[PDB]
Design brief:
Blueprint lengths: L14 H18 L2 E9 L2 E9 L14
Antiparallel strand pairs: 1-2
Length: 68
């Protein structure tokens, strides 16, 4: 489909205003999928919306912590 964005956080590169739109769009979409929050993260040059603290999936582990 002819769309301006495929990801909620594409606007992250639309200036400071875009940053707010990006984060807002991201956070909202995350909540809808049962995620505590959302933040715009760039992956492979791609400005993607990544949800943090999700019910099923966790979030992220860059340092890789312990289990318990």
């Amino acid at each position: 489909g002819s769309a301006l964005d495929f990801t909620s956080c594409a606007r992250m590169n639309d200036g400071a205003l875009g940053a707010k739109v990006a984060q807002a769009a991201c956070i909202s979409s995350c909540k809808f999928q049962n995620c505590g929050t959302g933040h715009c993260e760039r992956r492979g040059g791609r400005p993607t919306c990544v949800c943090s603290r999700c019910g099923n999936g966790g979030g992220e582990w860059p340092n890789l912590p312990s289990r318990g």
